[PDB]
Amino acid sequence: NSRELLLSKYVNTIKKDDNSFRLFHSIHGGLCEVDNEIYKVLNYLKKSRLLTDIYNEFSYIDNSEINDIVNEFFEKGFIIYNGQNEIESYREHEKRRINRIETGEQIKAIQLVVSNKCNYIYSSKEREIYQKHDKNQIMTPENAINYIEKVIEKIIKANNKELSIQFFGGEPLTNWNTIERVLDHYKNEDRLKIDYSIVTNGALITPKISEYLKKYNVPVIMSFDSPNRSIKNTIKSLEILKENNNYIAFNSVLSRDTFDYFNNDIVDFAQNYNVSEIGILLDLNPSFYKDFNLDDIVNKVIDLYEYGLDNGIIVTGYWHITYQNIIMNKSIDRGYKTCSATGGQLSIEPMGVVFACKGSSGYFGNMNDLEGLLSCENYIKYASRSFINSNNCINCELIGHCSGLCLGAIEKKYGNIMYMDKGACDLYKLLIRRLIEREKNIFRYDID
């Protein structure tokens, strides 16, 4: 709280031209563009300055304008008091969250694995055991409601006001009975707001199911990929969903296997069927980031993203959550960045066993002992790297925005969820940098 001021070392610069500098903070975000005069003021603060020194250094700018610039970028966290340790301040968020883990207030989401069957990777003992188990195949309505109720009772004691519940599987519509019973059971819930979603291949969608998903305002995330290496049934399901004005997203994979087939046609298809969003999942196999040219990966993502923007379709994915956090911070209040499995999610299997995520091998415990689940070492280990993935990340421009490569992938490759995958990191950094370079709706400060 002194008087000497300092440009934060976490402020990153992407120069667009000699009068345009795009700036963001590696922890906080705050993406914006500044003109040359404001950039000169910020850079003067690389050495600690008193405000009156900035006045005299410039002074061809009115003091009152210099004061406006300094105050705006202080509030953004781009200018700090000399001596402030910003990474220790960020890490305090992590330590506070770890210290309060027994409250359960960090639990924001249930991934409700209602079926492990599909219609007609892993690296732990517990996955082998329960993927096979005959009582872990179909979640009963009674067990589903009980599991959810245990979570709700815990988090409302922490005064949590919201909870997301994602119906997940194998193919969740193989267990519509349990989904429908859960929706009906909680229809009058008033202790907190429940938000639902469902991830499906959509093959089993009927007018009745579609009307019911709409009634409960359940966004439908449908797997879809362009022809590679069927579509009539996908069109049949989309036409049903669109008729009832359901919210539809596609989930598409950009991987070694889809790379040459991944193109912008999916946006034209989406617009035709009133699909609002297209999620792009980047390959979970780390060899993708060694074997494919990173600039070509980036261009495939950015081309789809920009053509989507031109067509009113939200092209998204974890990489886009990272980019949006760089514009407007939402991760601090959520307690996690793009991966909710770092303590924020309980992935509940039919027999009540609980993992970090269906994408992860991390076994937490069993819903018959939720307090034991939240106190166990594996749960603590996953929850402890939510804000800072690894000490690999401390000097990275994405530290406050990026969760690294999926837990399941680094579990398999390194046996260590703190071991960041360098190839994937390189891609993330290239992608975010290109998104910033190409942003058309940046907020720009001009000196006055």
Which residues define the annotated binding site? 118, 318, 339, 357, 393, 396, 402, 406, 425
Among 339, 410, 431, 436, binds ligand SF4 (CB under 6 A): 339
**Which of 117, 97, 105, 194 minimizes the C-alpha distance to 154?**
105
Judged by beta carbon, residue 176 or residue 343, the one nearer ligand SF4 is 343
- Nearest approach in angstroms of CB 70 to ligand SF4 is 29
Residue nearest to ligand SF4 (CB): 359
Residue 401 CB: number of other CB atoms within 10 A? 27
Q: Are 280 and 301 within 8 A, CB to CB?
A: yes
The answer to the question of residue 341 lying near ligand SF4 (CB under 6 A) is yes
Residue 53 CB: number of other CB atoms within 10 A? 15
Q: How far is CA 343 from the centre of its chain?
A: 13
Please list the residues that pair with 163 across neighbouring strands: 194
Judged by beta carbon, residue 8 or residue 389, the one nearer ligand SF4 is 389
d(CA 39, CA 444): 12
| Contacts with ligand SF4, 347-386, as mask; x by CB under 6 A | ----------x-xx--------------------------
| Token pair of 306 as six digits | 């920009």
The answer to the question of residue 340 lying near ligand SF4 (CB under 6 A) is yes
Among 45, 69, 278, 393, binds ligand SF4 (CB under 6 A): 393
Residues 144-173 that bind ligand SF4 (CB under 6 A): none
Residue 328 CB: number of other CB atoms within 10 A? 9
The answer to the question of residue 407 lying near ligand SF4 (CB under 6 A) is yes
Stretch of 4-12, 55-63, 168-176, 389-397 contacting ligand SF4, by CB under 6 A: 389-397
**Which of 351, 360, 367 minimizes the C-alpha distance to 385?**
360
Judged by beta carbon, residue 167 or residue 176, the one nearer ligand SF4 is 167
Judged by beta carbon, residue 346 or residue 398, the one nearer ligand SF4 is 398
List, as residue ranges, the binding site for [4Fe-4S] cluster. 118, 318, 339, 357, 393, 396, 402, 406, 425
Stretch of 144-152, 159-167, 178-186, 396-404 contacting ligand SF4, by CB under 6 A: 396-404
The answer to the question of residue 325 lying near ligand SF4 (CB under 6 A) is no
Q: H helices within 376-420, ranges in order?
A: 377-383, 407-414
Residue 22 CB: number of other CB atoms within 10 A? 19
d(CA 62, CA 71): 14
Count the residues of the shown chain that bind ligand SF4, applying the rule CB under 6 A: 21
d(CA 135, CA 137): 6
* Biggest alpha carbon–alpha carbon distance for the chain: 77
Judged by beta carbon, residue 354 or residue 396, the one nearer ligand SF4 is 396
Among 61, 179, 402, 436, binds ligand SF4 (CB under 6 A): 402
Among 66, 165, 425, 436, binds ligand SF4 (CB under 6 A): 425
Q: What are phi and psi of 21, to 5 degrees?
A: -125, 120
Helix 176-185 vs helix 207-215: crossing angle, to nearest 10 = 30
Q: How far is CA 13 from the centre of its chain?
A: 24
The answer to the question of residue 202 lying near ligand SF4 (CB under 6 A) is no
d(CA 250, CA 269): 10
Stretch of 75-83, 266-274, 286-294, 388-396 contacting ligand SF4, by CB under 6 A: 388-396
**Interface with ligand SF4 by CB under 6 A: which residues?**
339-341, 357, 359-360, 389, 392-393, 396, 398-399, 402, 404, 406-408, 420, 425, 428-429
